[PDB]
A paper describes a structure:
While no BChE activity could be measured in the total soluble extracts of hBChE-wild-type (WT), hBChE-1, and hBChE-2 constructs, increasing activity appeared in the remaining constructs in correlation with the increasing number of mutations, and maximal BChE activity was detected for the hBChE-7 construct. From crystals grown at 4 °C, complete datasets were collected and integrated in space group C121 with unit cell of a = 160 Å, b = 75 Å, c = 122 Å; α = 90°, β = 93°, γ = 90° with a resolution cutoff of 2.5 Å. Despite the presence of a translational non-crystallographic symmetry, molecular replacement procedure was successful. We found two monomers in the asymmetric unit and statistics for the refined model are presented in Table 4. The overall structure is very similar to previously recombinant human BChE solved structure (RMSD = 0.452 Å). Analysis of the crystal packing showed that each monomer of the asymmetric unit forms the canonical cholinesterase dimer with a symmetric mate through the four-helix bundle formed by the 362–373 and 516–529 helices of each monomer, as previously observed. Active site residues and residues forming the gorge adopt very similar conformations when compared to respective residues from the structure of recombinant human BChE from CHO cells. Apart from the mutated residues resulting from the PROSS process, the main difference between the structure of human BChE produced in E. coli and the structures of human BChE produced in eukaryotic systems (CHO cells or insect cells) lies in the fate of the Cys65–Cys92 disulfide bond. Taking account residue occupancy, this bond is partially broken in chain A (about 30%) and totally in chain B. On contrary, the two other disulfide bonds, Cys252–Cys263 and Cys400–Cys519, remain formed for both chains. Interestingly despite the partial formation of the Cys65–Cys92 disulfide bond, the overall structure remains unaffected in particular for the active site gorge region.
Residue numbers in the entry:
A (entry chain A), B (entry chain A): 3 to 529
């Protein structure tokens, strides 16, 4: 029982006990032909019918990816590792439906992050049964190919055209348009939300005309398509295809001859070589990711945003307080999760070489000067704080603000937030602060489960974030307009208002990081 | 009558009616042999005795110099023009003595400014009879050679060794040591005070060991030896000697052969050519000025200050609010004293080329970025204000602070001020603000004369400035320590306290222009 008839066949789900209520979950529904052998590196193929009833009571396979092993046994880094079998057969999606079955329900579609090299929708931190139970929305989750298997690019070649992972997400959005009405949802009321590389993916759908009728609104959590790490140039993506082929002995005279050889190698052989296709690899380097392929993306996001060519709708964008601290541990000299990581002035200068290898020896002296105007000249952690703000401002915070500013410049309602609560359950040290990716547990309502022992102020904060996230998806406004709560105002290009999120109280502020953002936007391009 | 016996002969002065009292003035006392013919370009020669009584009841000749004719009839620019005959016979000094004749009186020695190309001690704005009457100090004034006649440099050549004008001032200080006791003064209680190029001259005496026993303390008004315009390099001073010789047809095989030809030309012929010895001349370019001659100055001031090699004593340093506005009128495109001078963004960019011709096209983009962080983005006079602050910070304010900071770093008491009152009698337009050189009328007590129609608040401000100036000369502390007045604290390298001067009330502030000074001191040297 619990049978829903899709356009490709019947599926069977489960009923889950969630907070004294029931939520219907369909885990592991296929939405594309398995990209195997002949179909590796190609765009996803639409499914045909299946006979019988597909039993969707199980989290499906995770896409082929390397696993973070920098800290064995550490929950802070292994919580982002896949919790299902790794396989190329991984194009599946999940649906959570509130019980009893709703009618014309708002849909929220999650796109996970992972630097376009890792990630899966089955992580317990992405479980949408809490959102479906508390906010009565339908939550859809999806797995898309990462690494070379999802973004190996030979522009113009249909055997490996690039942006395959973005086409995986797009076909899952096509499945929602065709089938979500059978589950009780409104295909004209779908909101995309995602984090990190998932937020860049969400904003890339705003810039892809083919995805425009597949969703209504968008939520960008700590990421945007115009971030420096998001979209690489087509010739840079092409050079990484050859380098991978050269590493695997697949260098050939002909383009398809390269693909034919790569299709014969084991998926692990490809995974074991993606790290060596970039000359100088920064901890924020995307080995294989989105590019300008001429199909999903016809130009660089900065060019498309300037021309105003994007989906005209409302958006919700925001960042965390300490966005860059997580990446300082993974390769910046002098940093560690096992001590306070007080670094010298020269260690700061080596850190900027780690993150900015192509910047002139002059240019890093410019970054040094703009970030050493110490409030207290004798705070020992002055340089450790500065390098974290350098990574946070350039790679995440400032690009997120420019994306919201450009949407407001074209008459679209944007809502900016600033998440500044360090989780009591955060496994990383206290000096790393409100880290990259640790607002997701609050977005999905994990503090509401009392067995995980979050504070009562965290359950209140999570409940308000879910209410603001779901209200924006339902109505385009993340506010409860009458109960005399704090009203989240519209982010304007002028006043630049934004809302804080913490256990204390939500406050209205203006021009977030406006000073340091002016450096990256008006002086850094001039080297 | 009124006869004083000097070491070279008797002099006769006058008694002046000053505010219902008398002040004895000796105007035009010679202190060196006239630097004529054989003595042109050489260091001043000490005087021999004269028979009879030199009648010192007349302002002496002004040194040969060009006259500002940019605005005919304008009092704001012609008030700085000489008011006596121009002649090479100009090494004379003035003494003002309070009546009745005092005993062991503190002496204040004024050194005028004029960019080392102009200036005279006989200007009504430098009259020291008010200071002598009100504060009971002895005021000494001096004329020194300017232009090529005072700073034509051939390093190591006693026919034209350079820094002759600084040696003119030094011999006048030697005269004070030898003769001021006959006038009622204490040679061990002499304070040098000066403005603009006179303040750089004062600080250069702090850096010249030969001048150390010739004074006790120093007051620096809108100028310092470490200012970028103060001291030019010996080979740059040498190149300007040849260029002047080449302009006058005096190019020769031999060094003294050049001097012999230049000694034959008329003094006006030299004056008519000093403007063309510099390739790109900024409005703050010193055609012929101080250099490292190995005698008066053995190294650059920045090097001497770093090594701590200077006269250890108390100093009083300060600047005006709008130091750079005067120089924008004399050659910056888009500025004029007859309108509000609202300039565009490109006019600002041309202004930085006018003042920074040797700075890379890159480097002026750096100055552009640091000075365009507008408070109000739509103030029309935003760029006009920015260019005035660029000239004021780099050429005057920040070097004055570094000079006081380095003195405090070596355990010397420094007192910094910030003059921010626009004179009611200021002839220049209102947009130029508290301009360069318009605190001198208050230092010399001109507002006390009621026939000049200053406001009552200006007489109060002038009286307090004279009291602070004279108290520092007498005691080393510019404060009246008990009458519950505002206590001027010591300028420290840390807290960086300074005092404001205006008609409202004197207030204590900290770290003046600390942000923009950090740009010129820590980033601009790196181009
Ligand atoms: Cl399944
Ligand atoms: Cl419902
Ligand atoms: Cl509930
Ligand atoms: Cl092979
Ligand atoms: Cl492109
Ligand atoms: Cl005379
Ligand atoms: Cl007296
Ligand atoms: Cl009086
Ligand atoms: Cl000749
Ligand atoms: Cl030198």
């Amino acid at each position: 029982d619990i049978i829903i008839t899709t356009k490709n066949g019947k599926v069977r789900g489960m009923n889950l006990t969630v907070f004294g209520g029931t939520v219907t979950a369909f885990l592991g529904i296929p939405y594309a032909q398995p990209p195997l052998g002949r179909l590796r590196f190609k765009k996803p193929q639409p499914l045909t019918k299946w006979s019988g009833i597909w039993n969707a009571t199980k989290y499906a396979n995770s896409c082929m990816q390397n696993i973070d092993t920098s800290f064995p046994g550490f929950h802070g880094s292994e919580m982002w590792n896949p919790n299902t079998d790794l396989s190329e057969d991984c194009l599946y999606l999940n649906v959570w439906i509130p019980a009893p079955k709703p009618k014309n329900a708002t849909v929220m579609v999650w796109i996970y992050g992972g630097g376009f090299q890792t990630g899966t929708s089955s992580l317990p931190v992405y479980d949408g049964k809490f959102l479906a139970r508390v906010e009565r929305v339908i939550v859809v989750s999806m797995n898309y190919r990462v690494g070379a298997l999802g973004f190996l690019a030979l522009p113009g070649n249909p055997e490996a055209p690039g942006n395959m992972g973005l086409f995986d997400q797009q076909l899952a959005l096509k499945w929602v348009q065709d089938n979500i009405a059978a589950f009780g949802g409104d295909p004209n009321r779908v909101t995309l939300f995602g984090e990190s590389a998932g937020a860049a993916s969400v904003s890339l759908h705003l810039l892809s005309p083919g995805s425009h009728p597949l969703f209504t609104r968008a939520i960008l959590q700590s990421g945007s398509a115009n971030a420096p790490w998001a979209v690489m140039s087509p010739e840079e993506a092409r050079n990484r295809t050859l380098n991978l082929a050269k590493l695997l002995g697949c260098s050939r005279e002909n383009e398809t001859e390269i693909i034919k050889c790569l299709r014969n190698k084991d998926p692990q052989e490809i995974l074991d070589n993606e790290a060596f296709v970039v000359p100088y690899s920064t901890p924020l380097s995307v080995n294989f990711g989105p590019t300008v392929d001429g199909d999903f993306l016809t130009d660089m996001p900065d060019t498309l945003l300037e021309l105003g060519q994007f989906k005209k709708t409302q958006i919700l964008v925001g960042v965390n307080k300490d966005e860059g601290t997580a990446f300082l541990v993974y390769g910046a000299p002098g940093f560690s999760k096992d001590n306070d990581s007080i670094i010298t002035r020269k260690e700061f200068q080596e850190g900027l070489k780690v993150f900015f290898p192509n910047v002139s020896e002059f240019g890093k002296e410019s970054i040094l000067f703009h970030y050493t105007d110490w409030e207290d000249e004798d705070r020992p952690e002055n340089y450790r704080d500065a390098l974290a703000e350098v990574v946070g401002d350039y790679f995440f915070i400032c690009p997120a603000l420019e994306f919201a500013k450009k949407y407001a410049e074209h008459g679209n309602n944007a809502y900016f937030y600033y998440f500044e609560h360090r989780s009591s359950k955060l496994p990383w040290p206290e000096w790393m602060g409100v880290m990259h990716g640790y607002e997701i547990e609050f977005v999905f309502g994990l503090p509401l489960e009392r067995r995980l022992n979050y504070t009562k102020e965290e359950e209140i904060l999570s409940r308000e974030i879910m209410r603001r996230w779901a209200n924006f998806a339902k109505y385009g406004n993340p506010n409860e307009t009458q109960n005399n709560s704090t009203q989240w105002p519209v982010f304007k290009p002028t006043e630049q208002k934004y809302l804080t999120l913490n256990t204390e109280s939500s406050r209205i502020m203006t021009k977030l990081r406006a000073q340091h953002c002016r450096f990256w936007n008006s002086f850094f391009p001039k080297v």
